[PDB]
Amino acid sequence: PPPVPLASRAACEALKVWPNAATVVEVAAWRDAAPATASAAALPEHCEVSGAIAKRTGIDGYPYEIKFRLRMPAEWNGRFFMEGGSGTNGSLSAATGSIGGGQIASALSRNFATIATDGGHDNAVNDNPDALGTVAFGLDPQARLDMGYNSYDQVTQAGKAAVARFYGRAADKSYFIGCSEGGREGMMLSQRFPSHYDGIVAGAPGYQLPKAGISGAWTTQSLAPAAVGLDAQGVPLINKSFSDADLHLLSQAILGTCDALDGLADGIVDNYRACQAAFDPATAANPANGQALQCVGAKTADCLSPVQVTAIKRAMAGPVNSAGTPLYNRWAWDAGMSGLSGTTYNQGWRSWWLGSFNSSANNAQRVSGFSARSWLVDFATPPEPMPMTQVAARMMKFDFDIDPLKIWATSGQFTQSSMDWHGATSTDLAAFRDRGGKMILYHGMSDAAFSALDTADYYERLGAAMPGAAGFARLFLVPGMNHCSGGPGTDRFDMLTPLVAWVERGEAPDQISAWSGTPGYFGVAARTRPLCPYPQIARYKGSGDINTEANFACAAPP
Ligand SMILES: [Ca+2]
């Protein structure tokens, strides 16, 4: 170690004995304290380190490396923090330690040491026009492994080595927070690298991500009979299957059936299990006029066509093969499929399977967007690159007896299947639990990227494999919330404070305070509610402002 003062500009610049011999530091710079902005809390004086691990050339001829950026405050609380990724990764964030939940404060603003990665590929460099753009890292077997698990492992090791050198000691505790692809990363770490992090938050976790494109092919083919018009490739316009007003009508019928099943009519379906048992859009009534939601004759603004009802029922049921065997899971009916704030309709559910209505092209993530592209090049083995203009047609032609098997296959130099390197389905968390690890899962009920019911099923399997699982892992479902944020629900919350309390003081979260980022969905200026540990739900105490968390408690469903 250099004979310089610890936690100083001198110790920072001297960083330019890494666990990986192929670690290259490109930046080691002292940063003055930065003021708060409209979108970020103030950042303390810190050392910023950025670089890359394992620079190489892939079998596709493209360059690959695992980029990292690390920030270590001069005034340090002894804690290490890694933020998770999003989408197909490929970008390197500011690495101030995002905590999600719509929060403005970063972990660095709370004096954590913070680190981020791009996952082993770079969207500016690994952009191959013959392999569907920024998903093209899937052409290289090692880049897939880096994306699945190896990049986060290498970056955790490098960050902890820099921390030990810069501060003269290891972190007292290590924390990981991620949502979406970052939630998958958190679950992966608990299963594959249980000693890396003491506390993990995994929001809307894509722990079976290679199956998402199977669902996407299914919802695309399910909605196609309800489409009106064709795109430039002659493929039905899935975005035209439901107008925004049509989706709002569906959400209002769900509320009519399900809102009060928790005891309180408030625009929120807290009793999601009772809703799934009760709601059927083919039999549900339109609560406003008592007429059936499904049109008895021609289409009006107050009913849904039988073709629409058949289509959305089939999409929500989930994909099956020719024998009727489920290939993913089903989806929960919930009011956050729509939502109206002023004159603005909620787009956060429909953008995934349908796309924007006001378009002459398909733009749903699951039809022609990045999710369909990622399945073809990243999760199917061998990869299936093709023109971008053929993706929607490929989803339309998807064969549920043949194509779903490709996420379990190996081929040539692809020696692991995508479920092998990307899936995180293990319930063997004994090592994580026994060393004191704590995990908070959360998931929005109206998430159209990954099914909240599928996360619930993992949590049930976890409890069955390990009695007393609530002592170290708890799941917080969020009614009305879309993917990681948004929707008619209480989608904003501070996950880091209860995580630290659980890890360091043994205080399990019996509830987590949340508030709505768009309270106009309920016609109010603010709404706060408790998030409740599965299988509990929020229960109104019977009197007082229904928009105040103090008038609610967590309880078993009625
Ligand atoms: Ca309710």
Residue numbers in the entry: 40 to 55, 62 to 603
Task: Provide text from the study.
PETase cleaves BHET to MHET and EG, and the soluble MHET product is further hydrolyzed by MHETase to produce TPA and EG. Overall, the structure of MHETase is most similar to that of FAEs. The structural conservation between the hydrolase domains of MHETase and PETase is striking, and despite the large insertion of ∼240 residues representing the lid domain, residues Ser225, Asp492, and His528 effectively reconstitute the catalytic triad.
Of note, they pointed out the importance of Phe415 for substrate binding via an “induced fit” mechanism and highlighted Arg411 with respect to hydrogen bonding of the MHET carboxylate group, both of which are proposed to be drivers of substrate specificity. The only other amino acid with side-chain positioning correlated with ligand binding is Gln410. When Phe415 is in the open position, the side chain of Gln410 pivots toward the active site to a position wherein the heavy atoms would be as close as 1.8 Å to those of Phe415 if it were in the closed conformation. Given the observed dual occupancy for Phe415 positioning in the crystal structures, we simulated in triplicate (each simulation 150 ns in length) the four combinations of Phe415 position (open and closed) and active site occupancy (empty active site and MHET-bound). One of the MHETase disulfides is located at the active site, connecting cysteines (Cys224 and Cys529) adjacent to the catalytic residues (Ser225 and His528, respectively), which is conserved in tannase family members. A similar Ca2+ binding site was characterized for Aspergillus oryzae FaeB (AoFaeB), wherein it was hypothesized to have a role in stabilizing the lid domain.
